[PDB]
């Protein structure tokens, strides 16, 4: 059984759900395919916010139905992250969150790749494997974020002259992200650029893994 979930902006997602499922199960599927935690999403049907615990059959959901996702402005737990600069970040976290999940939330908020982030809580650096309850980080506690000069993966680009630049990249990154980094380090608008690797050129939709762009690979830049 397929169900539709649309946001107010127009985005749709399709979920396989059984009528016996509770709204919590659907919110879990939405975070699975969305990342948005359940304490920040409210599901809407024909005008009303469906209440957790009740099943889809309590609301006459059959196949082809359409629910609406609405994001909350907050969840139930927030912590504060201070930088060396003077900016403080109120980060929404779940208590069951791993430090890598927290760093991914920091990435969604401010953009830093998580392998360029180190988090301190009362002197101790936080291993990515541990969770917040391991370090007993409670709500409204303060962490220190220090940023690296580099992540784990860098690539090379040959500019319009023969000169080489280096890019901080993730295999996750799409060629639009790479073109944006080239713009930030070179000033060419992304659609004035063509990227060539192994004689092929890279469309702006597929990631660097799709082209097996490994670490220290050398791309060539062309103007269009």
């Amino acid at each position: 059984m397929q169900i539709f979930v649309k946001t107010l902006t127009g985005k749709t997602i399709t979920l396989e759900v059984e009528p016996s499922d509770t709204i919590e199960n659907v919110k879990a599927k939405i975070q699975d395919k969305e990342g948005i935690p359940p304490d920040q999403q409210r599901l809407i049907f024909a005008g009303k916010q469906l209440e957790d615990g009740r099943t889809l059959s309590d609301y006459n959901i059959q196949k082809e139905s359409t629910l609406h996702l609405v994001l909350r402005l907050r969840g139930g737990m927030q912590i504060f992250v201070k930088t060396l600069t003077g900016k403080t970040i109120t980060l929404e976290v779940e208590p069951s969150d791993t430090i890598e999940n927290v760093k991914a939330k920091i990435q969604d908020k401010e953009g830093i790749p998580p392998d360029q982030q180190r988090l301190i809580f009362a002197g101790k650096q936080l291993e990515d494997g541990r969770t917040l309850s391991d370090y007993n980080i409670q709500k409204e506690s303060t962490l220190h974020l220090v940023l690296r000069l580099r992540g784990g993966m860098q690539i090379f680009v040959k500019t319009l002259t023969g000169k080489t630049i280096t890019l901080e990249v993730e295999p996750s990154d799409t060629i639009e992200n790479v073109k944006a980094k080239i713009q930030d380090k070179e000033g060419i608008p992304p659609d004035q650029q063509r990227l060539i690797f192994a004689g092929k050129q890279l469309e702006d939709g597929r990631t660097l893994s799709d082209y097996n762009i490994q670490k220290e690979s050398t791309l060539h830049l062309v103007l269009r």
């Binding site: 201070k82 060396l84 301190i120 220190h144 220090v146 940023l147 690296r148 580099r150």
Partner: protein
């Protein structure tokens, strides 16, 4: 203004630590890169060797 200062100092100490950590990372990458350059160097060495021997064979046979 004495506690904002100490917190900036601890933040700066951790910043220095992570910066020299990244420096050692880049140095390790450069070391392995130098290794790969040496591999390529030996390759071009043997290629130049066979080029010169085929050259002398050609020049002798003509």
């Amino acid at each position: 203004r004495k506690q904002e200062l100490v917190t900036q100092n601890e933040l700066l100490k951790q910043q220095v630590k992570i910066f020299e950590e990244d420096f050692q990372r880049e140095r390790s990458d450069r070391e392995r890169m130098n290794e790969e350059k040496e591999e390529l160097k030996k390759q071009v060495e043997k290629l130049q060797a066979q080029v010169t021997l085929s050259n002398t064979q050609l020049k002798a046979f003509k």
